[PDB]
A paper describes a structure:
To better understand the peptide-binding process to MHC class I, we have recently stabilized class I molecules by the introduction of a disulfide bond between the alpha helices in the vicinity of the F pocket. Until now, the study of the dynamic processes that accompany peptide binding has been hindered by the lack of a crystal structure of the peptide-free form of class I. In this paper, we present such a structure for the disulfide-stabilized form of HLA-A*02:01, and we describe the concerted conformational changes of the amino-acid side chains lining the class I peptide-binding groove that occur when a peptide binds.
In the A pocket, peptide or dipeptide binding switches the Phe9-His70-Tyr99 triad into a locked state that affects the B and C pockets. MD simulations on the empty dsA2 indicate that indeed the His70-Tyr99 contact is largely disrupted, whereas with bound GM in the A pocket a locked state with a more-stable His70-Tyr99 contact is preserved.
Numbering used by the authors:
A (entry chain A): 1 to 274
B (entry chain B): 1 to 99
C-alpha cells in the first residue's frame, strides 16, 4: 500500500523570558520515529522507533543541526508575525509547520506538501505542484513574495520529490518487520440495554495498523448512519489503533444489523452480527 | 481561535481485573497547545503519568495521549480530568470499560 514520511513542528512563544517552546516529531506512516523537545535535557534529535537507532552519529548530528535551525526560523517568524498583525508582547502565539511526502505502493513519489499556520489558522502553504504558494491573508502574501524572491519553492520541491522519498524508502527497508507489516483489526461486538425497548450494539476494532479503517453499519443489508455513533480512531499506546462504532436498535431486532469492517490488513471486508 | 479538547478515556487492552493493563486519556482537537491532563484513581490524581510528544492534525488542532500502567480491580474508579483555556471548569470523563 501507500506510505508517507511527515515532520511536524510546533513553536509557542514565551513572552516574559527566553525562547519559544519548540517540539518536533517525525513519522513514517502512523509510526513516530524521532522527536526533539526544547524543554528536554539532551538538546538532540532523539530516536523513538528501534529501526532508526541503526543510524550513526553523522545522522543524529545532521538531524539535530536541521531541527535547531527550524526552531530558530520559528523564533524569528513569531517576531515577524507579531509585528505584521500589530500584536502586543503580552500574549503567547503559536506557529506550526508540517511537511513531507506520499508514495504509492511502488514507493514512487505521489505528492508532497509543506504548510504553515499561525495561531492555528492557515498562513501559507505550497500548492500541489510544489511550484507556487497559497497565502491566506496580506501578511502571508508579503511572506509569499519574500519566499518567491528567495526561490524557496524550488529547494523544497527538490527535497519533497527526491530526498524525502529516498529517506522514506530507506526507513521502509530498515524498519520492514513493523513498517511493512499490516495488523488486521481484532473485532468483536458488545450489547448494552438502556431500557427494555432500546439496545446498543457496539462494533469494536482493536490492535490494528495502519490507522486508516472504515466501520459501517447496515440494517437488512442497507447502509445505516442514523442512530449511530463512531468514535475518533485512537492510539492503543503500543503502536496500534482502536475504533468502535455503535448503533441503537429496537430490543429484539439485533439480528437485522451488521457491522462491516474495511482495513488494509483484511483481504476481504469482515461482517459481524449479534 | 480556541478549540476545546475532545476526550476519550480507555484501556489499551480488554479490561481484566488483576492483570497489568494501561489507562489512556486521549485529548484531541484542541488549540492552543497548553493543556492540563490528569488521570484519577477514586478521584485522586495518579502521579506517574506519561504523555506522547505534541503533534497535530490536518486542521492544525493538537492531540496528546496521557497514559499510566495500572492493574485494574472492580472497586477502583478511574477518570481523566482536563483543563484548558476553553473550559470554565475542569472536565472529567469517567472510564467506562464498555467504551
Ligand atoms: C528533524 S528536522 C529535518 C527534517 C528532515 N529530515 C529534512 O531534512 O528536512
Amino acid at each position: 500500500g501507500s506510505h508517507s514520511m511527515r515532520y511536524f513542528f510546533t513553536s509557542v512563544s514565551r513572552p516574559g523570558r527566553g525562547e519559544p517552546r519548540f517540539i518536533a516529531v517525525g513519522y513514517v506512516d502512523d509510526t513516530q520515529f524521532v522527536r526533539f523537545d526544547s524543554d528536554a535535557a539532551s538538546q538532540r534529535m532523539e530516536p523513538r522507533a528501534p529501526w532508526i537507532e541503526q543510524e550513526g552519529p553523522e545522522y543524529w548530528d545532521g538531524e539535530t543541526r536541521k531541527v535547531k535551525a527550524h526552531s530558530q526560523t520559528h523564533r524569528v517568524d513569531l517576531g515577524t508575525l507579531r509585528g505584521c498583525y500589530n500584536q502586543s508582547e503580552a500574549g503567547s502565539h503559536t506557529v506550526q509547520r508540517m511537511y513531507g511526502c506520499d508514495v504509492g505502493s511502488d514507493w514512487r513519489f505521489l505528492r508532497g506538501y509543506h504548510q504553515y499556520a499561525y495561531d492555528g489558522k492557515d498562513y501559507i502553504a505550497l500548492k500541489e505542484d510544489l511550484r507556487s504558494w497559497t497565502a491566506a491573508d496580506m501578511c502571508a502574501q508579503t511572506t509569499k513574495h519574500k519566499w518567491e524572491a528567495a526561490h524557496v519553492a524550488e529547494q523544497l520541491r527538490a527535497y519533497l520529490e527526491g530526498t524525502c522519498v529516498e529517506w522514506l524508502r530507506r526507513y521502509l527497508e530498515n524498519g520492514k518487520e513493523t513498517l511493512q507489516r499490516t495488523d488486521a483489526p481484532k473485532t468483536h461486538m458488545t450489547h448494552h440495554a438502556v431500557s427494555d425497548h432500546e439496545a446498543t450494539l457496539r462494533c469494536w476494532a482493536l490492535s490494528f495498523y495502519p490507522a486508516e479503517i472504515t466501520l459501517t453499519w447496515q440494517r437488512d443489508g442497507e447502509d445505516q448512519t442514523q442512530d449511530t455513533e463512531l468514535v475518533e480512531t485512537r492510539p492503543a499506546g503500543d503502536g496500534t489503533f482502536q475504533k468502535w462504532v455503535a448503533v441503537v436498535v429496537p430490543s429484539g431486532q439485533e439480528q437485522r444489523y451488521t457491522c462491516h469492517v474495511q482495513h488494509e490488513g483484511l483481504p476481504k471486508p469482515l461482517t459481524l452480527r449479534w | 481561535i480556541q478549540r476545546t479538547p475532545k476526550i476519550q478515556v480507555y484501556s489499551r487492552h480488554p479490561a481484566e481485573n488483576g492483570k497489568s493493563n494501561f489507562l489512556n486519556c486521549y485529548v484531541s482537537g484542541f488549540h492552543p497547545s497548553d493543556i492540563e491532563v490528569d488521570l484519577l484513581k477514586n478521584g485522586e490524581r495518579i502521579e506517574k503519568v506519561e504523555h506522547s510528544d505534541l503533534s497535530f492534525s490536518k486542521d492544525w488542532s493538537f492531540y496528546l495521549l496521557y497514559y499510566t500502567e495500572f492493574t485494574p480491580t472492580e472497586k477502583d474508579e478511574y477518570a481523566c480530568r482536563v483543563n484548558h483555556v476553553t473550559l470554565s471548569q475542569p472536565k472529567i470523563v469517567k472510564w467506562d470499560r464498555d467504551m
